[PDB]
């Protein structure tokens, strides 16, 4: 019942709508312009042909490493615990497995996001750091950095 699809100018508004509802932090027009330029690093998740989730990633060059950073990976609350998040994460893991040049995958979550910690830790991710005041106008502002070594 869950299918992933490409992010295009035809459905980019549906992606902005999902991110607005799922994530307390707002993203600028440049974030969404860049999402159309990353290819397989951005997908929509459909539950019975309804768009209910999305994943947006970018390549990062930090720590003298080639890393895949997950900017947003989310699902609408009533559709949670159905495997949508797993479908999106396995897609990113598969891309990295086939690419073979990424050293690690990493992301940021609020320290209060127990469901996100639980989800990522099931895939081999570890909390490698806790960054104080990472988020600016929301509480908690502190964020864990979750990373999976490849």
């Amino acid at each position: 019942r869950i299918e992933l699809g490409d992010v295009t100018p035809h459905n980019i508004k549906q992606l902005k709508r999902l991110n607005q509802v799922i994530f307390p932090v707002s993203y600028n027009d440049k974030f969404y312009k860049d999402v159309l330029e990353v290819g397989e690093l951005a997908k929509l998740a459909y539950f019975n042909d309804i768009a209910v989730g999305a994943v947006c990633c970018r390549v990062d060059h930090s720590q003298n490493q080639k890393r895949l950073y997950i900017m947003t990976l989310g699902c609408l609350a009533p559709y949670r615990r159905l495997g949508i998040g797993t479908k999106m994460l396995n897609h990113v893991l598969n891309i990295c497995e086939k690419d073979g040049t990424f050293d690690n995958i990493y992301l940021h979550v609020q320290i209060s996001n127990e469901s996100a910690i639980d989800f990522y830790r099931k895939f081999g991710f570890e909390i490698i750091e806790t960054k104080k005041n990472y988020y600016k106008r929301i509480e908690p502002a502190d964020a864990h950095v979750l990373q999976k070594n490849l």
Partner: peptide, 4 residues
């Protein structure tokens, strides 16, 4: 969740 990226913090922009």
């Amino acid at each position: 969740m990226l913090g922009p």
